[PDB]
Structure formats: C-alpha cells, structure tokens
Amino acid sequence: GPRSIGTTKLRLVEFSAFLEQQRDPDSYNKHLFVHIGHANHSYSDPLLESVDIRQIYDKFPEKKGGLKELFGKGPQNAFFLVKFWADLNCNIQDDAGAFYGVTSQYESSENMTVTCSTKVCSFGKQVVEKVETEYARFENGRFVYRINRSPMCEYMINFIHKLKHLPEKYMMNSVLENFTILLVVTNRDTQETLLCMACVFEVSNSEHGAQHHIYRLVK
Amino acid sequence: GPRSIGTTKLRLVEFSAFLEQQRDPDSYNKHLFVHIGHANHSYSDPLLESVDIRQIYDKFPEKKGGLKELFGKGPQNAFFLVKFWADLNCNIQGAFYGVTSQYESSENMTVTCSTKVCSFGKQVVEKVETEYARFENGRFVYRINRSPMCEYMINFIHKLKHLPEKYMMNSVLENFTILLVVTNRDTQETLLCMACVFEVSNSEHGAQHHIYRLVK
C-alpha cells in the first residue's frame, strides 16, 4: 500500500529521528536513524497486509489506557503496526554540537486540535512518555500538523549510545526486539482516536538503510 | 481518499493552483482554485476504476508527441485521468496567481515536468520545468514552489468567473484540458502522465478530484 501511515481522517506523512553534527565551520552532517521515506512493502498492492492485534498485546502497555482498550474503543481502521529498520551506521563525533531530533508531519481532511502521545516502552512497559498538542495549518487543500525538529529525550539519546556500543549486530537486534513505541493521535476536543501506530524495531541490513513496513492491525 | 497520484517510481503528493491577495499591509487571503487535497473516493486505498484512453484522445494533443504516442511508449501504469472540481467562489479585489506542486520518489533523479494547457484538444500554451531531487526525511522530493500562473490562465479564470451561471462555466470547461507529463530527464522514461479534465465545484466542500487509470 501507501508510504504514509493512516487514513483520510489522519495520516502520518513524514517522520524521521536523526542526529545532526557540525563538523567544521561551514559544513554539517545529518544522519537518519529511522524514517518513513522507504516503504519495504509494495506500492503495487493497494491493500495492506494485516497483523492480528492479539499477538502484540504483550509488547505494549496493557490494562487501563493500554492498547487493547484503545483498539476496543476504535475506530479499528486507525490502528497500524509499523516495523522500522534502524540505521545505526553513524560516527558519533567528539565535540560536534550534536543535535538529536525528531520530526513528524500529519495531514487531515478536518480542521482539528490534536494531541500526540508518544510512549516509549521496554518489555511492554512504559518507561517515558511525551504528549504534544498541535494545531492545523491549511495547506494546498488539507490541514497539516508539523512537529519540526523536536529534541530527543535523554532516555532515547542514551539508549542509542548504549545500542551502538554493543559488540555484535545480533545483540542490537535482541535489544531492539524488546523496545517499542506506541504513538496515539487524538482529537483533543472529542477525545476520538485518530491514529494509533504500534512501532517495532530491528537493525537495518547491509547497505539497504532505514526502511519501514506497514501492517493494518485487525481482530 | 488516496493521498497521492502515481506509481512506485514517482508520485504527485501535493498540488494547488491558487490566488493570494493582500487587502491591506497586514492582511493576506489565499484561495485555492484546484488541489489534490480532497480525493472524493469512498476508500483511503481504493482499487482504481479504469477509463479507456481511446475515448479521450481527441481532448488532448495528437499526432507526434501526442497522448497516443506517449501511452504506446509506456509504461502504461504511469497514465491517469484526473477529474478536478474547481472552486471559483473567490472575490477578486496586490494579487499573485500561482501554482505549487510536489513529487516524491525513492530514486535520485532529475525530472522534467511538462504542462500543456489545451483548448478543444489543441495545445494553446505550454511550460517545461526542471527539478532536481532533494533528499528529505528518507526520500527524494521534487518541489516546484509558488510558480507564477501564466497570463493565459489568469485571463481564462477571470472570464470564466464573469459568467452568471455554473452551467455556462461547465460548458466552457468541457473543452478545457491540461496534460501533465513528468519525465526522467536522463533516461527519457515517462514517470507520470496525468490527463486532467475539469468541472466547477458544486458541493460546498469545495475543490475535489477523482482519479482513474488509463487503459488501452
């Protein structure tokens, strides 16, 4: 299916988590750890593959406010599992004014105030969380919500450093297998769920770089 | 409905033709005549309906360089018919008439975008724009930002708006079409071709569009 994640009501169309480094006075480097620029699934099938949500409940928060309760309230067509391949091939330099950032953009057909909740989870339990509020800007026929260049929390900067100091790729894949992120976008005025993305992670292979694969969550 | 128009190699993700007006030194109005922000399809990811290309050949340029020749060279999965509903409910009072478009690809390419404005199937004005890939958040973006609308189209919009009834506007637009062709400049392969037809918006949701695949 498509490269962006969601429905007409709300689509995540741009996303990246990155490191910017100023090496010299007139030059800088930017490295992307994850992004939604390179779909791993085919654009030729218009239909997305599906994944039974019951088999990912233990990788995300549970009980009150957890994934099963969110999915039960619906709309079920707003729920996706997104697998990200992370590109960790980056030289983290000493004294380089490094900025670790996250950028995202959503689009909607409706003019809304939205609440974006990011829950970073370890073994299915929330370790840190961020809630952002964004307001629509009308652009070329749609409402656009931009979270530009937001700093990464210290937990994630430290996690990335820990991950890169591991001696083997399989150990990085092991650690990423228990690391998940739950993204929930809600209409702040009606409390309706607009988009829910359950994110899982693996290390990118060889020189294929960062990629993502979208699944609709069903059952 | 679907967000973008095109194939796996190239997609039109953003487009609008618009009028910006400055009433006074601190105020600004922007009105969109057409855009691809509201695809009026019942599904977000539909199976596209098809249209036999032989029944639109006489609405677009023919013979050498014409639509039949382009379609025969292929790839045929790059060819679409797009119907636009134009929003002409705008008070034309400092004014800038502009066009914006954005394409995206997984490959680093130099592209050429050809816009042919046609009257009774014959080209009346044409523009060719060249755009170099910009790497952005994991993919390559080709942005033609805020390009001035040609005088022919500004004048056409004024005379169309001056008609007193929607049905007369629709009669004029029956003979007005636009052919958009995007080409990989280095391999000359057709990346995207959109045969555009037009009607005046009737629903008070304003401008909308509908996509069809063109088949032989």
Ligand SMILES: Cn1ccc([C@@H](CO)NC(=O)c2ccc3c(c2)c2cn(C)nc2n3-c2ccc(C(F)(F)F)cc2)n1
């Ligand atoms: C207190 N708080 C909690 C959240 C926040 C906000 C602050 O802006 N967000 C981040 O901090 C933030 C950092 C890294 C992030 C993400 C978000 C994010 C979302 N996806 C889909 N992927 C993401 N990645 C990301 C994942 C894996 C890797 C790695 F290790 F595999 F390379 C690197 C980055 N603040």
Ligand SMILES: Cn1ccc([C@@H](CO)NC(=O)c2ccc3c(c2)c2cn(C)nc2n3-c2ccc(C(F)(F)F)cc2)n1
């Ligand atoms: C010398 N030259 C020839 C072409 C150019 C370039 C200059 O940037 N493009 C335009 O001028 C240009 C103007 C109006 C345009 C478009 C392009 C365009 C593309 N679609 C899909 N729709 C478009 N519309 C548009 C159609 C109908 C209406 C109306 F009347 F229904 F309201 C209003 C606008 N220069």
